[PDB]
Homo-oligomer: 349 residues x 3
């Protein structure tokens, strides 16, 4: 199965080599296309040529790539076209041990499989407190009735703590229960000029301390905090004090867009417009998956199938670009163009 994907990838990248009619192929390419096209035409009864010239030949080669991409991805598109009919036998073609795959394709699939099947630490994209319902004006005093220290969130990545003169307390629980961090990177600062409940300015005297797990931490320096050890603020000062604690970034085992090299650039390639046919085809193929059909996902995918499908579709887009096929898709209605940003934008519903 990983070999099946490695083969489809190998064949599609080889076809993207056919930029022109009379060019001379690197030997490696002809050896692969030869075997692949022969197995394919045999089990399918299509008549793909190794060096396409006419539009009909280009379409036919492109359809071979489409078949291979769908079979490796495990998708069955359904009747999307009067010109193309998916050949389920392609899976047999791709499982033939005689079709070789390249070192690049092999290594790329090993990556998809290796990272996708495990977990590892990664810098998450958004603010640690992005999913909060309430926020407090930054730098304005606020103490909850009966407490001497009150921590409150003032930004998507920030909290501020108000301390009564001489007060001390633990502040960690404000950070708990959200996300599932492995490490939280903090930097704390003295809020030098803040607003009192009444509206008048007040200063924070030097002398306030923040300690993590009992050890004293300087202000304005990154702190690696495990999220468990006690986060203790102490105002030894004889006046009210305010400190801000910023979560500069945190790491968890949720997958990000950096799980696979240049995943973002691949996703971008897949969701580009190109023209109405690609747009229609891409949409139709993605409808058979858990991926959005015309706009990049909000959260990065995290399973083998989604990642594979994106990689496979990105390569197919490149093949589309070099073969320039022309065929019909149900419900798609072409505009001669010559195609503009306005026209592209309108196609996204």
């Amino acid at each position: 199965m990983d070999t099946i994907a490695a083969r489809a990838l190998t064949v599609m990248r080889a076809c993207a080599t056919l930029q022109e009619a009379r060019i001379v192929l690197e030997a490696n390419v002809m050896e692969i296309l030869g075997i692949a096209i022969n197995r394919y035409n045999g089990l399918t009864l299509r008549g793909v040529t190794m060096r396409p010239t006419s539009l009909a030949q280009r379409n036919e080669m492109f359809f071979m790539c489409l078949d291979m991409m769908l079979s490796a991805a495990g998708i069955n598109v359904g009747p999307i076209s009067p010109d193309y009919t998916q050949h389920m036998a392609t899976i047999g073609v791709l499982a033939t041990p005689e079709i070789p795959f390249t070192t690049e394709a092999a290594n790329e699939i090993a990556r998809v499989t290796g990272e996708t099947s495990t977990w590892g630490p990664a810098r998450q994209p958004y603010g640690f407190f992005l999913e909060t319902e309430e926020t407090f004006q930054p730098g304005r005093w606020f103490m909850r009735a009966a407490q001497a220290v009150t921590a409150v969130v003032c930004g998507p990545d920030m909290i501020q703590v108000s301390l009564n003169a001489g007060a001390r307390g633990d502040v960690q629980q404000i950070f708990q229960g959200r996300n599932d961090p492995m490490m939280i990177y903090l930097v704390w600062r003295r809020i030098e000029n803040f607003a009192m409940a009444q509206g008048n300015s007040q200063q924070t005297q030097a002398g306030v301390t923040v300690s993590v797990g009992g050890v004293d931490m300087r202000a304005g320096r990154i702190i690696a905090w495990d999220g468990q050890a006690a986060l203790h603020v102490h105002n030894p000062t004889q006046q009210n004090a305010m400190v801000q604690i910023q979560v500069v970034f945190y790491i968890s085992m949720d997958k990000t867009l950096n799980q696979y090299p240049a995943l973002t650039a691949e996703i971008f390639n897949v969701y580009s417009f190109r023209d109405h046919t690609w747009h229609g085809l891409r949409t139709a193929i993605l409808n058979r998956t858990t991926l959005p059909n015309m706009l990049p996902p909000i959260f990065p995918p995290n399973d083998r199938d989604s990642i594979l499908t994106l990689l496979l579709l990105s390569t197919l887009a490149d093949v589309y670009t070099v073969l320039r096929p022309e065929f019909a898709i149900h419900g798609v209605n072409p505009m001669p163009g010559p195609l503009t940003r306005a026209i592209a934008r309108a196609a996204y519903v």
Copy 2:
């Protein structure tokens, strides 16, 4: 023309293989260098060797790469050196169908061409409201004379709305006319403690609602908003209220640095110092383009030419690094070194 670029790229990457004198080449490399160097020396009358040993031979091979890079990029450098003279006939060398190009180079050019010639949605880099002339203190009440609800910008990615008791209104126009978003991702929060015009604190009672296109949206959860549907805030409460609405990120059809895999790393490679000669050469080549000559652009390039030139120049930098040529550039004056960060920094004007 895409083939021309694929060939230049193929040849340059092959030359970067010549790390040492006695190593044995992968066959594929010798087959390519053989043909390429032969066509080149023939139409040019230079005498490039396949396995350079002396400095003179290394310079000569490097000049062949420089010629190929300039011809594929469509640039004419002019008289930048007493040691090197660009050979315009190189275009004829690169258009020879007998020089093969690799699957990697072919696929890379297909990408540059495919993405560059169309449009597609992409997460933009900066705050949705980065280009605003005025900003309002966050969490401080502000109502425009005669209105019951007043929306105002309080950050590069943020707006806050002040609502009179019982008030309701549409807030979308504050977001309109800037950028050309396809989707805006929002999260709204109740500002739990804010400043009244006088300076005294006030609370926002639970009960405030935000609705998009008529449907009710919870606070602290990402909302996919098309930017057209009505953004309606309602304060059913008997006291003043404040809500913050954060644009966590938005997508448009403007090109970002993720349009091509690892574009940033390529750009970084091109603008690195290396030494005075590379610095001088790179600057001279970039002067013939719309790209800045010594500092990475502020906004990502978006046309085929710029992208190609960056990719081609990045590869040439790698060749420079392995061939270690030594030649003179007009106006450049070498410092033996051994080269430091201070010296590098000073070279950037």
Copy 3:
């Protein structure tokens, strides 16, 4: 030495090709494995097969890759296993000019060497003022005794300046002495509604100006400032004024995670869990370096060795993934699983 790394890389990527038992290899792969395995078995006395089937054969091939990775990285792991013993003679294998390296591996090493040995401008990751001990409430007036203009930091990427009616002054020193910027990209805004020391709101009248090096700059537009030229604010207005100046991003010669294509994805791959053996092995290998052993570094590495080791280890992880070896590491105790996120997370101390 660069050739040594290019060879280890070439061999390891070839081994990741051995996905299954009966598949047919691309010729290029067999030519390389043949020579490499022969030199290796000869100088080492191990008996690696070219097409491993049993677990014992897979372990043996994996150990060959481990030896090659350690020798190219210059690491000596020590006695980490009763099943594996590092063979120092591997360096002799890798220095044999008859083992060929691929164009990909060669080009990848040229990059590591080229960028690592020089300096170049790069957009830094965090806020320009991330390392500040004190911060001032945003949008609240504050004037230092005896001055007419007072600049103060109000965010990790922001400063605000309070101007008395008719006042003018230079503001650049607030930006100096921190980081070592080559260029700072600014955008200034009028704070339209701010808090006076007493708590009452005040407006900033239009008419305030910001000029860089004597030239007038509009508000809400990015400004490329060298950090040296005078940053002059002028309030020609007859009332107090406040302006915010945002450092949207800056560039310096400190290395970022974009110094090498998809460095982040490689780092992610290396620090992924996989299973207890990989986790143990990776930790043991990283203990011999300046890199953290189980969590990605906070600051990007900047020397050849670290970068190389990461690249080499990432590839070895892929080999691990395809060969699926099974051996013992001192102090590591396997859990049959089938392995979950909870179990993975617990392994990170």
